[PDB]
Symmetry: D2
Amino acid sequence: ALKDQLIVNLLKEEQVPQNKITVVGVGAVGMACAISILMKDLADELALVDVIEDKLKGEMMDLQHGSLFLKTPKIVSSKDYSVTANSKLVIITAGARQQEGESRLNLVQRNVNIFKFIIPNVVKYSPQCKLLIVSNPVDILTYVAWKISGFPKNRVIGSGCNLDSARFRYLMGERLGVHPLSCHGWVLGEHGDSSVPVWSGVNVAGVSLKSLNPQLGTDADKEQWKDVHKQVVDSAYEVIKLKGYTSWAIGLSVADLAESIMKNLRRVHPISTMIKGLYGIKEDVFLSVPCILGQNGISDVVKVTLTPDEEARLKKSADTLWGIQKELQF
Amino acid sequence: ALKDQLIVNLLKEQVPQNKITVVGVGAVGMACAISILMKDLADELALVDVIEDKLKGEMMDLQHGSLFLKTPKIVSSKDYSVTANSKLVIITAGARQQEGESRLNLVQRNVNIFKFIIPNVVKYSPQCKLLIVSNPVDILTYVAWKISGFPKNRVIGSGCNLDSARFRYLMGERLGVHPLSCHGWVLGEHGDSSVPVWSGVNVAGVSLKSLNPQLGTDADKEQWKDVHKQVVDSAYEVIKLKGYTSWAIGLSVADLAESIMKNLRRVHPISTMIKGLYGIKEDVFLSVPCILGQNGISDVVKVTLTPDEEARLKKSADTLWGIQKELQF
Amino acid sequence: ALKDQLIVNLLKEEVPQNKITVVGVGAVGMACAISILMKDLADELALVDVIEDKLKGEMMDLQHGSLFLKTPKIVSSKDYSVTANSKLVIITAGARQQEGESRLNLVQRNVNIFKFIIPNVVKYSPQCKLLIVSNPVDILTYVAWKISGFPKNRVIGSGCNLDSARFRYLMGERLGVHPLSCHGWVLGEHGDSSVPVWSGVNVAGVSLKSLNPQLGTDADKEQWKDVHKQVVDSAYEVIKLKGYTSWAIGLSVADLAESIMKNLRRVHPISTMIKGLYGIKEDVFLSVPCILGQNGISDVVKVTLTPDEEARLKKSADTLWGIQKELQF
Amino acid sequence: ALKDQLIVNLLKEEQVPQNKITVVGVGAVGMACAISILMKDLADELALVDVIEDKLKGEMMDLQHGSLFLKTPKIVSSKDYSVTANSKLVIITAGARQQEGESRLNLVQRNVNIFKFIIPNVVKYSPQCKLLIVSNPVDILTYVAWKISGFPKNRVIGSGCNLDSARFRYLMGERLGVHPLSCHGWVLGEHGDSSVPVWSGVNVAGVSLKSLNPQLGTDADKEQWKDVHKQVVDSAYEVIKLKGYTSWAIGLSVADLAESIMKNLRRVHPISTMIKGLYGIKEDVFLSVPCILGQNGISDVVKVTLTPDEEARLKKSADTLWGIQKELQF
Ligand SMILES: Cc1nc2ccc(NC(=O)CCNC(=O)CCCc3ccc(CC(C(=O)O)C(=O)O)cc3)cc2s1
Ligand SMILES: Cc1nc2ccc(NC(=O)CCNC(=O)CCCc3ccc(CC(C(=O)O)C(=O)O)cc3)cc2s1
Ligand SMILES: Cc1nc2ccc(NC(=O)CCNC(=O)CCCc3ccc(CC(C(=O)O)C(=O)O)cc3)cc2s1
Ligand SMILES: Cc1nc2ccc(NC(=O)CCNC(=O)CCCc3ccc(CC(C(=O)O)C(=O)O)cc3)cc2s1
């Protein structure tokens, strides 16, 4: 055999991966997550799962052909969740997505039914993984993943407002002529229409914009900064309208969260977690607050001091989600 | 204004220094784009297409990921003025082959498109290299060269960089070695007439043909020729499963973009003019190993081919030359 | 020749596009060099020093790692012709402080050395950005500005970029949060008179001073003032233990190089002329938050300092102008 | 406390790192290894060990102060090996180094005695690690570390000729005007004076340079390519003469090996391993041959086809190392 003439084998060695990530769903979002994760060298094995077998195999092969240009030496796929065994991180991107001009909340029942199949299968093969929920409505679906999985809450994370905040900082940076990395500001609450821009924390170099413009973000704002948050809220709708769907920004947002988890960075991200206790919330509502994210998922939450107006808006985001969540059966 | 309360401007207009343009925002163009962005190759990225909503949507979606990137300006337009001062312009526009359709069947459609795109590209970017991805890529690199009037060093086809990456992937799987450490060259047409250079296939400098002189022949007990067949068939297998290909070509193009933008002078199997070599007397473009840097292809490696390998490469050349005789400018 | 048997040359090429020069191959210069190489910032790296053996050895040692890098030309000489066409020239030459010695004590030794260095740099790269790292950095940025004849945007001092990084590290350790998510600014002189801006210290936009009004004062139960004291004493503590500092300043300088080379327009606390701010009427350079990109410092952020914070800064200011006004060169 | 006003803890912090690397020795080589590893984002924790307390703490602090610019969230150090617990990779750079005009082989008794202390303490706290030997003479010290550790031979790796080959490829590329990445050539055998340039394997794009110039590497060679190997052999001595020591190139070479190990790449490197049973060698000689390197260390060896002269030179390298190795007591 040519291989045995060339190479003396010293070790048989089932190569059990140490930094494996699974992406469930090979729609545009799943594949954007996949490419971003591959190009950030976060995983030693990447597994893809879907129910459409030709599509799944083709995406896998397409990725495999780029292996020379990557540093992820095993890429695998199957409809069978055994392919997902030993994942540190499992990212769920499966489900229906909103039409142009349709709320994410309109997807809830269809994606809950899907999660009733997906989540136990994931947990069966990787009982100690962190789950990262991307599917919409992400705050509710993170609650549902949590209830279905039986995992402790630190290990069930929603991608939440990591992207809304990235969008906010992009638009802020465009207005100011400063890189988004140096423009700070937080969008919290629902990943959707009722998200809350925290005007009180918006700053560059520690200089609060609200101290320079007391009306910042209100109707009375002469520069109408509220329209920056409106743009954040409308972003998905606009991109859907233009291109049909969104993919690249969310892929990058998800890869950013995967990086904090896989590298134990303990950076702070606005992501969906259980907020029972804070700002007077008594039910098991999940929504985005700033969380410390690392190898054990969400270990700590930053307590933002919200103005009465910001707290009011966040109470209302919380109310909207509990309004849908409450009726659920699964 | 708030901006002026916060920031004192101290300085008056700069050219981007490391700009890349991608023409075409299909799956291939956008895969090139995301790969280039994630490799930090450019200080400005421009996208061009003819479908305006789709173009704006793609631009916006990349823009929204700016926090996670180091490319501070992403722009798009149907108008080529947006591409001004590019160092590299990557062309991914055109028709794509159906299942069972040869890339060579795309030539008249993509030539007509190139007659528009190429003069508009070169107009605004005096320092650019032209990297052609659209198919048939060897023929279209010749077409881009003829229309642009650029010198040959500046007009590069993505060629067999991807075919060779595929070959090395498949070889790696057979041998249990990373593709980076598995060496082997697929030359000629990026298509059905490509040529696997068995004489050069090696790990750690050890020629696999020296261990098995039957390597890659019908007598080969391990049928290594099927690795090359899988290379030839790979686009059509992926097309059949997924409907198109994107990720691997995107990564292959970003690999070439890296060598050009960083002046690396790595060797790649990419489409260039081969008149003068292997008894080829006409202006045929096809893949040979080329040294690629900031001025494009500055040098060509003269691969010593066996008589059979050389005849296969000349057959690829003849096929491509035949199609070139169909071209009308 | 073997080269010509293997390779056919297409053209005789021109000048690098992303060249960086490091002046000084002491521990700081080489830490800047390796960090720059590992961040893929330059297509050419040039080293200059006056100790020829040491210079050649450092260059060779870097060259020997080229396989693992993507910087295709690494060069060195005592002669500044080697620095031609640099985009960025980083000056790390000069005396460094012994244990217990003040940075201000270095001033006449390093001013003398800059009288030789700066005109030679400007002769070969008249369009470069100058990044001054030698100490006292605020005064030596002034000196390089005056000698070079460059506009102020192109003469930048590393300033408090490192001090702020140290602050964010110490803050991170106290809070159990990555420094990337812990925000706070140390401004003014890169030395004992630096100013911690307590009003701006925050995580996720939540002001630490709002939670603890006495933050940074003597009444502070947790003595956060000690964090700024540790920042001030950092270089001295490290010098006492190891004899010098290198890694952190090297990384800090590479971070600034990254913003400049990739035109990122991030905000950094670096030395620039602050005449017109905080009741400063003279040509003083010290650290404020600056937007840094391909033309150097284009913009300054106006930090709203408390009366005590501003007093501390106008004191940092006065300390530096005392010396600066009387320099002869 | 302020931390508790700011942050609500949700999870009891049982932190155990997943991708920890330890560097023993904070000399120039050790610290070059460290900064290179930090800048390649290979580890979630970096531990340093030495016996000089102040120098150790200074180096650790200096790295820590750059944390903002890195993605390695915990950097620690101690004279005590408890600090190294749970390492996946431990890199040994400790020991005497050669003076100008002294052979690496002359360091053997000093560094064997040091290894008798270091190696048992490393394996005490990191039972899962790969051991990467950098100290000299590296080939013999890999053998020694193997015998002392009780590890299987796949997990005890010498940095070997990974550097000599990188030097060879740099000089080659300089001559041809090609990036070293595309200039292929192998230097095998001792990391030292008896190393063997494999001229028969030297190629660009699969084109043998020896087929073009049959005299390649011999004295009759008009272009004197043998001088390239001579420069490889003399590299350390030349740089030591000029600069006092070497650091950057070995640091990058070690980080290259660490990347293949930590990311399970299965790339081929010329590194120190047992060669008993190849080329007629009958004793437990360790030297560099091309090896496949991954998460379990060296799993496979490539059998290079050498010319009779190349093979004789390799056999001679083995004989030289055995001549020193057979006298060792530990
Ligand atoms: C039993 C079963 N098992 C499986 C297994 C796999 C699959 N496979 C799929 O379902 C793949 C197709 N589905 C998608 O890709 C949905 C993507 C959702 C999405 C879209 C956009 C954004 C970001 C966006 C916004 O928030 O709207 C913004 O803000 O930009 C976030 C999330 C189906 C089943 S059924
Ligand atoms: C006047 C005008 N100006 C414009 C400007 C823009 C556009 N825009 C588009 O045309 C966008 C849509 N077109 C595509 O995306 C074509 C991609 C071609 C492709 C596909 C696959 C592979 C690799 C593959 C293989 O070789 O088959 C393998 O080997 O995997 C290579 C190349 C149209 C016009 S019209
Ligand atoms: C006519 C002539 N031309 C030349 C050309 C070259 C040279 N070459 C050298 O002088 C090389 C040796 N010199 C050094 O390396 C000086 C390092 C300065 C330093 C040290 C520490 C920190 C950071 C530190 C802090 O800021 O204090 C902290 O905060 O950690 C910053 C800066 C001499 C001459 S003479
Ligand atoms: C009981 C004890 N425990 C400890 C623990 C720590 C320490 N600490 C130190 O010993 C620190 C100082 N020692 C060094 O740093 C030695 C570096 C060796 C080196 C130098 C150069 C090259 C590459 C080079 C070439 O091969 O020569 C080329 O080819 O370029 C390779 C290897 C002492 C003790 S004692």
